A paper describes a structure:
The integration of the viral genome into the host genome during the life cycle of the [name]-1 virus is an essential process of infection. [name]-1 [name] ([name]-1 IN) plays a key role in virus integration without the need for any other co-factors. [name]-1 IN consists of three domains: N-terminus, catalytic core domain, and C-terminus. The [name]-1 IN catalytic core domain (IN-CCD) itself has integration activity and the activity is eliminated when DDE triad (formed by Asp64, Asp116, and Glu152) located on this domain is mutated.
The comparison between the cryogenic and non-cryogenic structures was direct because the crystallization conditions for SFX-XFELs and conventional crystallography were identical. By overlapping the cryogenic structure with the non-cryogenic structure, we observed a good agreement with RMSD 0.31 Å, except for helix III and rotamer changes in the protein residues. Even though the unit cell volume of the non-cryogenic structure was greater (by approximately 3.35%) than that of the cryogenic structure due to the cryogenic cooling effect, we directly compared both structures, and found significant structural changes associated with protein functions and characteristics. When the cryogenic and non-cryogenic structures were compared, the orientation of the helix III was found to have shifted toward helix VI by 7.1 degrees. In addition, the number of water molecules in the non-cryogenic structure is lower than the cryogenic structure, from 29 to 12 molecules. However, this phenomenon is thought to be a combination of poor resolution and changes in the dynamics of the water molecules as a result of temperature, since several water molecules that cannot be seen in the cryogenic structure are clearly visible in the non-cryogenic structure. At ambient temperature, the number of water molecules making up the hydrogen bond network was reduced from 3 to 1, and the direction of the sidechains, such as Asp64, Glu92, and Asn120, also changed. At ambient temperatures, the non-cryogenic structure had a relatively wider catalytic cavity volume in the DDE triad compared to the cryogenic structure. The average B-factor of the DDE triad in the non-cryogenic structure (94.5 Å2) was 22.2 Å2 higher than that in the cryogenic structure (72.3 Å2), and the B-factor of the DDE triad was 10.5 Å2 higher than that of the entire structure. The B-factor in the non-cryogenic structure of IN-CCD also shows good agreement for their dynamics properties in solution state analyzed by NMR, which is not seen in the cryogenic structure.
Author numbering:
A (entry chain A), B (entry chain A): 56 to 140, 148 to 188, 194 to 209
The structure:
């Protein structure tokens, strides 16, 4: 519920790798299709994420994905630390896969379908996650 | 000054292409290094952008970059239209190139340097652009 906590995980679909970042307090999602699970891709994603949102701590369900020199250097430079302290994260990753399946025919490539699904998830109201994160961040500014 | 207007342009550095999106009302920036200037890369970028921020209209200094079937299909699906209505956009693209030059040694690859520069630009206060965009968006929600 703290506004700087994000959850990062990878999932697999059609032989490809989808990196999914969830803003825990709001359920707002950022995702990316990457060619392979590598430290360089995780580091680049963290650096991008932290330049766009105030990323204070990152949690993950696979701690070993954060052990590479490259990843630690990105967290070091951006000032990110590892979160050492549930149902939100489960529901967001599972709803994402459902939406991807729904819009899969609308897109030539998986990566396009993934961004359509992120779009749909963040705008769908039940307020939307996208409205909740800006409200959470803007109120925290005060 | 309307909260849904973005400016998109490409610039070149070290033989590579940097796609820069500026939120006009705040000066908040999103950037990406792409391998080549193609409609597919512009479309993918727009789709990503619109899933993260409320993108209503897009302006550009090279109108021909928005003519491809691929790009129009992305704007169609995301509900984006073309803005047909100054000093902000100039200052943001020029300050970005300056910061890249400053942090260039800190990074192995240009794309890393670009994300460091985006990070620095959005956080630098003179409020920051990153604080201004969430304030602008959250107030507009009301
Ligand atoms: C494990 As993944 C790369 O996040
Ligand atoms: C994700 As880090 C290593 O903090
Ligand atoms: C011209 As550019 C691709 O924006
Ligand atoms: C950028 As569109 C074509 O609207």
């Amino acid at each position: 519920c703290s506004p700087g906590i994000w959850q990062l995980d990878c999932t697999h679909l059609e032989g490809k790798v989808i990196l999914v970042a969830v803003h825990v307090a709001s359920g707002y999602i950022e995702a990316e299709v990457i060619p392979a699970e590598t430290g360089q891709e995780t580091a680049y994603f963290l650096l991008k994420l932290a330049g766009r949102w105030p990323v204070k701590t990152v949690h993950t369900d696979n701690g070993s994905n954060f052990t590479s020199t490259t990843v630690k250097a990105a967290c070091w430079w951006a000032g990110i630390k590892q979160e050492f302290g549930q149902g939100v994260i489960e529901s967001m990753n599972k709803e994402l896969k459902k939406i991807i399946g729904q819009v899969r025919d609308q897109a030539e490539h998986l990566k396009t379908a993934v961004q359509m699904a992120v779009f749909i998830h963040n705008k769908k109201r039940k307020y939307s996650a996208g409205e909740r994160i800006v409200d959470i961040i803007a109120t925290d500014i005060q």
